[PDB]
């Protein structure tokens, strides 16, 4: 089943964050490894101490990427030429991560914050989803 759920922290307990692989690879491939119109997608660099259980992404001086998405509960989608500020749909801590694969995306995985009170703000690192 491509349908999964992140392991973010609400108020001390880990809660399953609605996240489908289908959309995850769709948003990553859709956004591609090219940004500049607005701000998204963004270049990911070894910083969140993430490995994604992969040798390619595990790399330190590698070239990854990150893009926002709307889970099932949301009723919108992220645009191309729309920054997080202009974005109307709503805030989303969950971002799809993918390697540059020399001009390709391998949906390395989707990450999220560990501080989702109500507005899914997030302060801690970006824990990978499962």
TrEMBL record:
Keyword hit for Nuclease: yes
Keywords of the record: Hydrolase, Nuclease, Signal
GO molecular-function terms, A-Z: hydrolase activity; RNA binding; RNA endonuclease activity
Disulfide bond residue pairs: 6-129, 57-108
Record keyword Magnesium present: no
Entry protein name: Hirsutellin A
Shown residues within the full chain: 35 to 164 of 164
């Amino acid at each position: 089943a491509p349908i999964v759920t992140c392991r973010p922290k609400l108020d001390g307990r880990e809660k399953p964050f609605k996240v489908d692989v289908a959309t995850a690879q769709a948003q990553a491939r859709k956004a591609g490894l090219t940004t500049g119109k607005s701000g998204d997608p963004h270049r990911y660099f070894a910083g969140d101490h993430i490995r994604w259980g992969v040798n390619n992404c595990d790399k330190a001086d590698a070239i990854l990427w990150e893009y926002p998405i709307y889970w099932v509960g949301k009723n919108a989608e992220w645009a191309k030429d729309v920054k997080t500020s202009q974005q109307k749909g709503g805030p989303t801590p969950i971002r799809v991560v993918y390697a540059n694969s020399r001009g390709a995306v391998q949906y390395c995985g989707v990450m999220t914050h560990s501080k989702v009170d109500k507005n899914n703000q997030g302060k801690e690192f970006f824990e990978k989803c499962d």
